[PDB]
Amino acid sequence: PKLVYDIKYFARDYRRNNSYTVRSVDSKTPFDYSKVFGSAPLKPADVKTVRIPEVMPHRG
Amino acid sequence: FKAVADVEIDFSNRAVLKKYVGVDHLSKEQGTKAKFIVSLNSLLEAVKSVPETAEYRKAIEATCQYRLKVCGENNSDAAIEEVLDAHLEELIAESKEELRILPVLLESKPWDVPADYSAPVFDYVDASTILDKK
Amino acid sequence: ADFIVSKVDTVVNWARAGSMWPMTFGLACCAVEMMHAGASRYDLDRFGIIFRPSPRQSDVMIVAGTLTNKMAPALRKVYDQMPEPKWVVSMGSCANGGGYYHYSYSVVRGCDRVVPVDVYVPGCPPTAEGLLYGLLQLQKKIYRSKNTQLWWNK
Amino acid sequence: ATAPQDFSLAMKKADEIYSGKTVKAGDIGFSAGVPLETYNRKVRIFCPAKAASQSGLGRTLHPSSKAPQWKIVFENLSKWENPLMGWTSTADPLENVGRST
Amino acid sequence: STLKPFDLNANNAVRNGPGGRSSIGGVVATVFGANGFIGSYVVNEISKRGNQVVCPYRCNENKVQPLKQMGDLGQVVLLPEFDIHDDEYIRRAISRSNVVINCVGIRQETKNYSYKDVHVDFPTRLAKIVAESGKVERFIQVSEMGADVSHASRRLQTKAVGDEAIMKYIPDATIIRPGNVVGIEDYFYNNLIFQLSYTIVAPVINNGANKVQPTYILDVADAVVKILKDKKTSGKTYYLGGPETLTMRQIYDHLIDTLRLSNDDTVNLRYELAKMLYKPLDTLRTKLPEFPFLGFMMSSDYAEEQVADSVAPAGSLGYKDLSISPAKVTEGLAIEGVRFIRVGGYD
Amino acid sequence: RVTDLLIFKGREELETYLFMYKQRHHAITEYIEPYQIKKLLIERKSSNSAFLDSFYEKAYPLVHSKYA
Amino acid sequence: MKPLTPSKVSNFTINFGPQHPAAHGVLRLVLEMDGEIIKRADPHIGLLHRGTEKLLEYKTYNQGIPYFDRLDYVSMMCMEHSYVLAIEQLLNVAVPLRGQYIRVLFSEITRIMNHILAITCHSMDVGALTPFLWAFEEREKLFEFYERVSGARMHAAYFRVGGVAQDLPIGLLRDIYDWSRQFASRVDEMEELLTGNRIWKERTIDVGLVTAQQAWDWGCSGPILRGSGIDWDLRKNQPYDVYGRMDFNVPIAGHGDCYDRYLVRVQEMRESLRIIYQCLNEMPDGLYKTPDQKVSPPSRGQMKQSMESLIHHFKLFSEGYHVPAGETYRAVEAPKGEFGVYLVSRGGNRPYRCKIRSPGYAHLQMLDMVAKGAMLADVVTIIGTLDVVFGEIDR
Amino acid sequence: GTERRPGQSGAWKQVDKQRYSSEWEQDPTFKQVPKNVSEVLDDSVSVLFLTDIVRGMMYSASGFFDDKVTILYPFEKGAVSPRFRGEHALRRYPTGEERCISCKLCEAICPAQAITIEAEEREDGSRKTTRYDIDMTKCIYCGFCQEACPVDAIVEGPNFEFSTETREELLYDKQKLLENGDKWEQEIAANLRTESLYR
Amino acid sequence: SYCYARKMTDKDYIAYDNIKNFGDNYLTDYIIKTVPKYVTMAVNGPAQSSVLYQEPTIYTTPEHIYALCAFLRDHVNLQYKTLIDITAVDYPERSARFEVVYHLLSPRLNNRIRIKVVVDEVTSVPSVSRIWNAANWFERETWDMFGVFFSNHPDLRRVLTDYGFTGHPLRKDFPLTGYTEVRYDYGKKRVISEPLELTQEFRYFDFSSPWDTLSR
Numbered sequence A: 001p002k003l004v005y006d007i008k009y010f011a012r013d014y015r016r017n018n019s020y021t022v023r024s025v026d027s028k029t030p031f032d033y034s035k036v037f038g039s040a041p042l043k044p045a046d047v048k049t050v051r052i053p054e055v056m057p058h059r060g
Numbered sequence B: 001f002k003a004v005a006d007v008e009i010d011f012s013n014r015a016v017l018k019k020y021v022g023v024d025h026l027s028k029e030q031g032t033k034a035k036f037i038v039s040l041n042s043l044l045e046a047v048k049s050v051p052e053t054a055e056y057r058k059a060i061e062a063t064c065q066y067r068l069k070v071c072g073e074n075n076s077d078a079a080i081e082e083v084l085d086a087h088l089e090e091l092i093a094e095s096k097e098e099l100r101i102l103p104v105l106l107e108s109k110p111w112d113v114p115a116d117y118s119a120p121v122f123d124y125v126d127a128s129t130i131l132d133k134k
Numbered sequence C: 001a002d003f004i005v006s007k008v009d010t011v012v013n014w015a016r017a018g019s020m021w022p023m024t025f026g027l028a029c030c031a032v033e034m035m036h037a038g039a040s041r042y043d044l045d046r047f048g049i050i051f052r053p054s055p056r057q058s059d060v061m062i063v064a065g066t067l068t069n070k071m072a073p074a075l076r077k078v079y080d081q082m083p084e085p086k087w088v089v090s091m092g093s094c095a096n097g098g099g100y101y102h103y104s105y106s107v108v109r110g111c112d113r114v115v116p117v118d119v120y121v122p123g124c125p126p127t128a129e130g131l132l133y134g135l136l137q138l139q140k141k142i143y144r145s146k147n148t149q150l151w152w153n154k
Numbered sequence D: 001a002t003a004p005q006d007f008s009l010a011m012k013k014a015d016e017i018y019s020g021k022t023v024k025a026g027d028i029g030f031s032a033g034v035p036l037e038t039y040n041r042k043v044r045i046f047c048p049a050k051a052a053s054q055s056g057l058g059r060t061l062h063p064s065s066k067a068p069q070w071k072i073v074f075e076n077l078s079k080w081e082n083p084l085m086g087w088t089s090t091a092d093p094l095e096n097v098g099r100s101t
Numbered sequence E: 001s002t003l004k005p006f007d008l009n010a011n012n013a014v015r016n017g018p019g020g021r022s023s024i025g026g027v028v029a030t031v032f033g034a035n036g037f038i039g040s041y042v043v044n045e046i047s048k049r050g051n052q053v054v055c056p057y058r059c060n061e062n063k064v065q066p067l068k069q070m071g072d073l074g075q076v077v078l079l080p081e082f083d084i085h086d087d088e089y090i091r092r093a094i095s096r097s098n099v100v101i102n103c104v105g106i107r108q109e110t111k112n113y114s115y116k117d118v119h120v121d122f123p124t125r126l127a128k129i130v131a132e133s134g135k136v137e138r139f140i141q142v143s144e145m146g147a148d149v150s151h152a153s154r155r156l157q158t159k160a161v162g163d164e165a166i167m168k169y170i171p172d173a174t175i176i177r178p179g180n181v182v183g184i185e186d187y188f189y190n191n192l193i194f195q196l197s198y199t200i201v202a203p204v205i206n207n208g209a210n211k212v213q214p215t216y217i218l219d220v221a222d223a224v225v226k227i228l229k230d231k232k233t234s235g236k237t238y239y240l241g242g243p244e245t246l247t248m249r250q251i252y253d254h255l256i257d258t259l260r261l262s263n264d265d266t267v268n269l270r271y272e273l274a275k276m277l278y279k280p281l282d283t284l285r286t287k288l289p290e291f292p293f294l295g296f297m298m299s300s301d302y303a304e305e306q307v308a309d310s311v312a313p314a315g316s317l318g319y320k321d322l323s324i325s326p327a328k329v330t331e332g333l334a335i336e337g338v339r340f341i342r343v344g345g346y347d
Numbered sequence F: 001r002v003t004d005l006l007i008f009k010g011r012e013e014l015e016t017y018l019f020m021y022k023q024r025h026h027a028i029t030e031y032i033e034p035y036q037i038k039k040l041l042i043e044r045k046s047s048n049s050a051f052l053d054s055f056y057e058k059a060y061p062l063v064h065s066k067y068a
Numbered sequence G: 001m002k003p004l005t006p007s008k009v010s011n012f013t014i015n016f017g018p019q020h021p022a023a024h025g026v027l028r029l030v031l032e033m034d035g036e037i038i039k040r041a042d043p044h045i046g047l048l049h050r051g052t053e054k055l056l057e058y059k060t061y062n063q064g065i066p067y068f069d070r071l072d073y074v075s076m077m078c079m080e081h082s083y084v085l086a087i088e089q090l091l092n093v094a095v096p097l098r099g100q101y102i103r104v105l106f107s108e109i110t111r112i113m114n115h116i117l118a119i120t121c122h123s124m125d126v127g128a129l130t131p132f133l134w135a136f137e138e139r140e141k142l143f144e145f146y147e148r149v150s151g152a153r154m155h156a157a158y159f160r161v162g163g164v165a166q167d168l169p170i171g172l173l174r175d176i177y178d179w180s181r182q183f184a185s186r187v188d189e190m191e192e193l194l195t196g197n198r199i200w201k202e203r204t205i206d207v208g209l210v211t212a213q214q215a216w217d218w219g220c221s222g223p224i225l226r227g228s229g230i231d232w233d234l235r236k237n238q239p240y241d242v243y244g245r246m247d248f249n250v251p252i253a254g255h256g257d258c259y260d261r262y263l264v265r266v267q268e269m270r271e272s273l274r275i276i277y278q279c280l281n282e283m284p285d286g287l288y289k290t291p292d293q294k295v296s297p298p299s300r301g302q303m304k305q306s307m308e309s310l311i312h313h314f315k316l317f318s319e320g321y322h323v324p325a326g327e328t329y330r331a332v333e334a335p336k337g338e339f340g341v342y343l344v345s346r347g348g349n350r351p352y353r354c355k356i357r358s359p360g361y362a363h364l365q366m367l368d369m370v371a372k373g374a375m376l377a378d379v380v381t382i383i384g385t386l387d388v389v390f391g392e393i394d395r
Numbered sequence H: 001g002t003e004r005r006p007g008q009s010g011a012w013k014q015v016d017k018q019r020y021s022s023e024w025e026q027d028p029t030f031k032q033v034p035k036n037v038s039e040v041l042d043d044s045v046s047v048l049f050l051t052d053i054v055r056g057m058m059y060s061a062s063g064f065f066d067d068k069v070t071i072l073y074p075f076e077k078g079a080v081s082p083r084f085r086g087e088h089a090l091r092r093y094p095t096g097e098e099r100c101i102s103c104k105l106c107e108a109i110c111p112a113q114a115i116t117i118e119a120e121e122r123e124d125g126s127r128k129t130t131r132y133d134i135d136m137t138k139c140i141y142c143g144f145c146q147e148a149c150p151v152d153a154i155v156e157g158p159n160f161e162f163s164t165e166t167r168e169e170l171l172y173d174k175q176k177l178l179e180n181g182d183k184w185e186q187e188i189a190a191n192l193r194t195e196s197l198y199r
Numbered sequence I: 001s002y003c004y005a006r007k008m009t010d011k012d013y014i015a016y017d018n019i020k021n022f023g024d025n026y027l028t029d030y031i032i033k034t035v036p037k038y039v040t041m042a043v044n045g046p047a048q049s050s051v052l053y054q055e056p057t058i059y060t061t062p063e064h065i066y067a068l069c070a071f072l073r074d075h076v077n078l079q080y081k082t083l084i085d086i087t088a089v090d091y092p093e094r095s096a097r098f099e100v101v102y103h104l105l106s107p108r109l110n111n112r113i114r115i116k117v118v119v120d121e122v123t124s125v126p127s128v129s130r131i132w133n134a135a136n137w138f139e140r141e142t143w144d145m146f147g148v149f150f151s152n153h154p155d156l157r158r159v160l161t162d163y164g165f166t167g168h169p170l171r172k173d174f175p176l177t178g179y180t181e182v183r184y185d186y187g188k189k190r191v192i193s194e195p196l197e198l199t200q201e202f203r204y205f206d207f208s209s210p211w212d213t214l215s216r
């Protein structure tokens, strides 16, 4: 354990360091369907998959 | 997945699989490629009622075009299933389910909003991002 | 005669205590501990305790779970249908005193408010051996009674 | 005093976007379904003062404080001791609701 | 309505709470005969209001089971071994008690206990023991309405003699004298029904001429509470008769009607014949244990008490002095119990 | 609107008895018994005013009394 | 001028009361039946409503964990697991790998006992009593593991925010491994008595038929989905612990009848045995609870030697940790389906709102659709496959 | 096994479907028509001779002769681990001085609010409790109070035989808890010494 | 749509890349742009599905809830075929006290969405049972616990609370112990309800620190 003689919570404080940003969305600007379906596969070969996360986050 | 039946059956037959997992309950029809093409074209005809400069209509047009393309290059009906991550039967039922809510969307007309419409969006920033690095 | 009456009452106590027909009012967690207590590993049928589905044929009643205001009338109705000896055992903190749902709008603080309780078995859940200890305490209570001698000198 | 810049932002925003319909005073109390003698009880609306032991300003009405600090409290009623175990017994249903929630 | 205090000295200090189960009432009570029909309801009334009730009982755990539910923790104290001849136990029972209620009585004689013991010796002995203490403030004794020194029946005569002895030792005692009490566990309607249904013939002494004033158990239980809530009631005998005076023939007929019996099973066993049929059977009773087959009805004392009119004397205290309106025992909730048996749409 | 809610709740109260959700003893306890009790009640018209009676009874009038 | 045709009327509004060979708990069921066939079923619940959700609001977060154990007495670990996961998400707390493994292991163990009880109690409801007693000995062996780790056979309260309450006692992994060496043979013994039996087949085949669309419409989860042909598992589709590493296959059936769900549950027991073996072999070494002592209690020697640790111990066992303002819904694959907690925090030490999503609530709602056209005897089997727990249904 | 016959089913409508339609032969799980004479005899004798029944009969009959698993509860007791949470007990130091220092943390951590504590300064000057009562009809035996105590004063002993005949005896007090600690001192100490290694 | 088992082996993937992206970062913008009238505000926050991802929360008004739910279930790209639960949260500080929360699942998108309708005691929320059959009991529970009326519900009845219960228990103004208590009386051989008395009162322990900052 590297925390025995090296104590710094503010470096390891994730609870109080979360924040919420703000945006405004409007109907006038069109949605980018190029992003949604341009990256979509058109053939079986191009299919890409997201693997299951093996472990949940741990400090180590 | 693993079959829970002691009886030995072949799951590469691509019909014994469908009989085992109960796709027949979803639709008694075989669900060929031509049926999918017809369903997509009927959805395209249906969404004509929605105004031309409506984001919903553009979305349905884009999705139908993408799926008609995926039907285009892929001559195998199973290949369409692999690309679209679905059985052809449920892909066909999908367009009918879309057809069902068109009357409800034409009664309230959600696309009508004023030219100053603004929907505030609040986004969450994780501390792990900032603490580890910037 | 005072000797004969004593022999009769001790035989009657043996008969009543050895063959206890319990009816289990299994609301909640404790009913499964009772399930385990009547399983292979603890043989209640060796003790002579064998569960009977209907109240009319049961002489001991075990309240094992959280009694709610919705249920207490049904608990009392079941208790009234039982025959005259009718010993009642309260098992678990919920039945004994409301327990962990004590300060709730829907919970009765102890089945003692609704029905008289002879033996209280504490736990959450009470260990099965603890339930057998309570049943043996009730068996001792039955042995203690000398009804026929009291009948002679009444 | 600047801004919390957290979930409270969306909380306040949900507050200002939405609103409640006006009703006559006391009409909702009948809809609540509680005993009507509950509303015979009198209410004191106050903010707790700072404890003299501590020097923190969180509990006070201060620009630092971002939490609700105004309580509805009901008047104190009779309390007695359990004859068997000396526990504090009460018959007041509204004893701790106002302070707690 | 405003709750009225239990008029006991220094009650104002000890009392606290709304008057419910968990509240504190300043009444500690030793109710003799608690497991009986009358005693159980009195215990229920006293304990319901947060008071502590000491219940001496002859060893019988199953009989005293309902009394356990009556009160909160530590309020109903059940003393295991009660003997009417044991002074030390009586002193221990009334040690902390400021009111004592005596409901101990026997409907019939046995070999162990006679009327003169239970109805005379026990009241006198208990009266002396209560008098020497001084802490006990209120004493209530429960007796029959027809009890008189000049009564043919031995039960009703011994009861009156015991009441006079109690009045001698404690001058401030109140003698509650209810009529035939109707209840779910009563010995009036239940015995009449058992006579009508599981007996070959229902013998009725004379033609049912004897008049009675039956009262409901809840009314007597409330009357006990009203006695204890007023100190002005002390030293007075209250004849708690029912709202309506009825002949025994009317009650038998109305039971037959409510139960929808096919016809009248009652027969005329006139007096001077019961006095010959039951007279040896009394000597039989005094030499044999308690037997379910024969009791109460099958005695010369019952015939003697069913040839007189057990009604309240004209000038007398009653429910009106206690501001209670007695409920009719031939209609309403009182009669539900017999109603459940049969009403002609039933079975 | 409050009237609508109250009517819906009263309809629920009726439906409980009509559909046998509640039982006979519930009807006895909550309606018939109190009404019969009120008729059978005899009370002495108190000469003391309302304040005097509550003052004699309890320190805090707002607390309920049981078995009055 | 063409005659009209009249119809028939249904009566017999029966009341099916609390009944012992059924899913455990008290069930009041009002059934309208045309003759011997049911036309409407209206389950009456609230007989075990203890006001859990409102009681949570008056307790601190660590004080409210034992509520989740008692919500479902068959599967305690899975029930408290969702609560601790939601608090961890709001607190941004990372669980050490050993504790993640211990949680997955004991979750699989409670899954196995749940399936054992479900199958054997369902057989008892049918009327076969031998598998039931043959199963209690296994369930005792697993309760012994619980009493070893926590000191309580049923309500362990072992899962905590940031890890587990205590470490695994020495010798436990060997004992669990032995129980695993013999478990498959025991399950095969049970499987022969149930599977292949003509009376069991006749009682269960084509009873309680559900289709995939119906299951999604009514919000069903777990064995009900997988017996109809839906390849959906939270442990695979939405992993929540080191389940992603674990290698196991979803059991799938297609008919949707009672028998298919029974077969699914047996295969689920086998898959859980495989997951347990992987957990045993790959169990890491190190911390079992989070190193942060502002959300987890310090060790006893540490509180007895350090001032900061005594302060943290005092403020965690009196006030508790403060959870940042936010809302979260965390779901776990419980043995009965998907169990989720919707936790709303305003920044205090007590939950403002803790909604519990019952997997069995939607199944009991589905009872009416499933038990249409059936018989009075079929209701018991249909209830058995739903495997409803009424303390779990009535929070 | 898993395979099903056209005749055997539990639902009337499904029986009607299979009786009057041949969609069951399309389905893989069902058993197909025998197509040979010998297969017809095999299936006919299987159904008519109750074959599957007997196979379960032998495996059940194995139950008669296998080693019974049961415990004579009075004579033999089930295995109990050191961690076991049972009847509560207040503990004393080896000198005879109570370990309790009235921090009142166990009352704050009690999920069920079963502990009521009030204290004072003792004449010597120690922080000691004038009252420590636990409601065992309200306890849930979580063991949180044993976790919160900084001096090991309160422990859940190894005793599960503490049923009573009245509820008042289940309202423990300081004297009763101290007596329970005295009665089970050595066992509690051994369990704590073993448990200290882990935590 | 319906996750009918298709791939017999090698379905190790949580989902496809495109399906994940469309729902990881475009889902709220897509909803707002497609059906703008229904949406009033949107919040992206910690995910219901997982810790690592982000899931949307949409605030809509009671009048638009039925059409928004119908759009969410049957839109080709967004197929929220499942209603996980329906819940309400009481905020007495607000004029519109109750926030009715809807939790949905899209099996195809492997995503969770949360829909909030903010109402008060008098206003009603249209029932969504026709969209999801599971809603019936959830709306009945919301009516029982909080007192929120649901319009056009097939039969809105109380579920959890005792028969004859008129108060709504999960309202923040409702006492924790309630107002009444249940006991059997010997005199009247019935189980009866009486005003509450507590032998030992609930002890509220105020643990709040002045120095804390997380409290909002």
Ligand SMILES: CCCCCCCCCCCCCCCCCCCC(=O)O[C@H](COC(=O)CCCCCCCCCCCCCC)COP(=O)(O)OCCN
Pocket (backbone or CB within 6 Å): H007, H044, H045, H047, H048, H049, H050
């Ligand atoms: C094939 C040879 C060709 C020659 C032709 C000869 C024809 C057979 C003549 C032999 C006479 C002996 C027959 C034994 C009795 C069986 C009667 C018919 C068998 C039968 O139909 O099977 C089931 C009846 O058995 C049951 O299942 C009843 C329940 C039994 C439970 C109790 C069992 C007791 C143990 C068995 C008796 C052992 C006695 C000694 C211990 C019905 O059911 P199904 O639906 O499958 O048939 C209907 C399918 N359309």
Ligand SMILES: NC(=O)C1=CN([C@@H]2O[C@H](COP(=O)(O)OP(=O)(O)OC[C@H]3O[C@@H](n4cnc5c(N)ncnc54)[C@H](OP(=O)(O)O)[C@@H]3O)[C@@H](O)[C@H]2O)C=CC1
Pocket (backbone or CB within 6 Å): C154, E032, E033, E034, E035, E036, E037, E038, E039, E058, E082, E083, E084, E103, E104, E105, E106, E107, E113, E118, E142, E143, E144, E145, E177, E178, E179, E180, E181, E186, E187, E188
């Ligand atoms: N019809 C009525 O009920 C009426 C009754 N009364 C009078 O009220 C009194 C009681 O009424 P009720 O309760 O009906 O009579 P019960 O016999 O029902 O009650 C009698 C009580 O006295 C006890 N008891 C009797 N003999 C002895 C004894 N020798 N030693 C100790 N305890 C004894 C009994 O205990 P155990 O059960 O062990 O004997 C029982 O608890 C009687 O005197 C009766 O005359 C007044 C008006 C009418």
Ligand code: SF4
Pocket (backbone or CB within 6 Å): C028, C029, C030, C031, C064, C065, C066, C092, C093, C094, C095, C099, C100, C123, C124, C125, C126, G070, G073
């Ligand atoms: S006492 Fe504990 S184990 Fe028993 S029913 Fe209540 S919560 Fe469940």
Ligand code: SF4
Pocket (backbone or CB within 6 Å): H106, H109, H110, H111, H112, H113, H114, H115, H134, H138, H139, H140, H141, H142, H143, H144, H145, H146
């Ligand atoms: S074990 Fe838990 S409930 Fe029992 S006294 Fe200790 S802290 Fe309280």
Ligand code: SF4
Pocket (backbone or CB within 6 Å): H099, H100, H101, H102, H103, H104, H105, H106, H107, H117, H145, H148, H149, H150, H151, H152, H153, H154
């Ligand atoms: S038992 Fe332990 S935790 Fe409880 S007051 Fe005493 S020292 Fe404190």
